[PDB]
């Protein structure tokens, strides 16, 4: 209801494939229903909640389709690939938060919103690219549905966005137009988030903790920081470019801007992190 | 603009495909920016929109994909490639609406929500196809959104959804799960309309008029027309049941459930029917 703070959730790779999952439907809803479960717990515990996910392997799996049946079919860009890949992925959230509603008797209230993400032509990114190939990472500037969102919030509705990072675009003298790239999908949401004014953003993994020395011997997991510990101990390398790095770098932008406070954790402990019992909390400097 | 009155307007075909034009992205991207421009008249004018949309080729462009590639990458079912359809037209849809709203120096407040679509899973349909190569159209009971959709224009957003009529779904046992068909997007759109409770539904096509006898020697284009006289007109079978047949009953229902007008014109001549001057225009008794 009207009452309750507000939190970004950003769901990672788990929430639709376990390791050496294949990439069918079923398997992919499977994993979603129980994703849906854990969150409907944070919207039963009185929250407001922002839903985004990644969409790596669900928008590879299209962009696979679309060159391999280019002699039948034309072939989609990249971009149009990724916006296919939300609605999927949306209408799965979707489909499954409703599902998990009605099982607590509660009337369905969420929905799922096409997102674009405007990045800067100008960027390093797209003169030195990365994973497939080769293919740019741009930083996000806007979420163009940014204010449509909030209303959705304002109005207590369980929004669901920027499946994947949003659809990269860019604005040249008024014209929007997609870009062929890839957002990080948490960058994208601490974007959100902190524009949102949140008072919260979490991001779920498959990991319950970030930690320094990891996979190692001296290894620490981080529970409860603060913002000038984690800012030192990620200019020491402890995450990883691909993996940890840019979650840290989305937690430490959104509490440095905000002072509101990150969280870290295993998607199957969200609603233990909100409380206090576990996972990296990164707080106030 | 809390003040206009609200019309749901249901875009064919042509908003993105003319006679015989290739499926690739910027064919149907530039049909969709001429679409755009008419639409933005009536936003213009002061009128609310929500926007629907058809989707026969890029459903069956993606469900083509989907099947050349069943050796490669996993094979979608049909209302996922449904959903799939919906992200990348309403992709394209809320990017051109964007754009042209920014080409009148006005900011941006558009939407597109993955949309699914309540059916009966015993409808006739399922027992024999027959919509078109011949399948199935099942008969739309509820636009699951509608909460949001309200809401969203009880907020004056330019709201984009029920793209191809929406993802097809059914509801046993408190549990949503998809049905393989497709929805009428007309049928569909009637429903929300009247749902919504709108001042007009609208049916934008590519004929100016509904006619009976159509090509026929005695050819009558209809203007406008009390909702007995349609009726009667109907029921002789004038229109076609692949095409204006389900138009037709789709603004009769509109009619009879509001009392409110309903239109069937070509989408360039869409402002002049609300303001009485063409198109074929039903009304109440
Ligand atoms: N310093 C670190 N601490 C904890 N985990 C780390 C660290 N560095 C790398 N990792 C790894 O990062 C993994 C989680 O990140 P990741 O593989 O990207 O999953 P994900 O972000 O939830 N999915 P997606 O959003 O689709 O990219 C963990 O499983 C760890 O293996
Ligand atoms: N009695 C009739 N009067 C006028 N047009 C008719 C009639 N019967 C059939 N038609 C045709 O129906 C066509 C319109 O419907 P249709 O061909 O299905 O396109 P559409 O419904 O606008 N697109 P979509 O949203 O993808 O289903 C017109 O172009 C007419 O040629």
Redesign the interface.
């Known amino acids: 209801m009207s009452a309750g703070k507000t939190v970004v959730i950003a769901l990672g790779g788990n929430a639709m494939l376990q390791a050496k999952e294949?990439?069918?439907?079923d398997t992919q809803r499977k994993n979603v229903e129980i994703a849906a479960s854990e969150i409907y717990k944070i919207h039963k515990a009185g929250y407001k909640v922002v839903l985004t996910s990644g969409n790596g392997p669900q928008v590879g799996?299209?962009k696979?389709?679309?060159q391999?049946?280019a002699g039948?079919?034309?072939e989609?860009?990249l971009h149009?690939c990724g916006?296919?890949?939300?609605?999927?992925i949306?209408?799965?959230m979707?489909?499954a938060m409703?599902?998990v509603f009605?099982?607590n008797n509660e009337?369905?209230?969420?929905?799922?919103?096409?997102t674009?993400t405007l990045v800067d032509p100008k960027d390093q990114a797209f003169t030195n690219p990365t994973k497939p190939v080769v293919v740019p990472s741009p930083r996000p500037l806007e979420i163009?549905?940014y204010?449509?969102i909030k209303?959705?919030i304002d109005?207590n509705?369980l929004v669901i966005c920027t499946n994947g990072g949003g659809?990269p675009?860019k604005?040249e003298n008024?014209?929007?137009?997609?870009v062929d790239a890839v957002i990080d999908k948490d960058l994208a949401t601490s974007l959100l988030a902190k524009t949102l004014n949140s008072d919260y953003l979490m991001i779920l993994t498959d990991v319950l903790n970030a930690c320094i020395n990891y996979k190692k011997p001296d290894e620490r997991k981080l529970e409860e920081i603060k913002l000038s510990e984690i800012l030192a101990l990620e200019k020491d390398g402890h995450f990883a470019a691909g993996s940890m790095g840019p979650k840290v770098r989305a937690a430490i932008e959104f509490t440095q801007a905000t002072g509101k406070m990150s969280i870290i954790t295993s998607l199957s402990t969200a609603v233990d992190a909100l409380n206090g019992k576990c996972g990296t909390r990164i707080i106030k400097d």
Chains 1, 2 share one sequence.
């Open positions: 294949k990439g069918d439907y799996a299209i696979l389709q679309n391999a049946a039948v079919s034309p989609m860009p149009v916006a296919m890949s939300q609605g999927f949306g209408y799965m979707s489909q409703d599902n009605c099982a009337p369905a209230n969420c929905v799922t919103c096409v674009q163009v549905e204010g449509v209303t959705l109005n509705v659809i675009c604005r008024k014209v929007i137009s997609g």
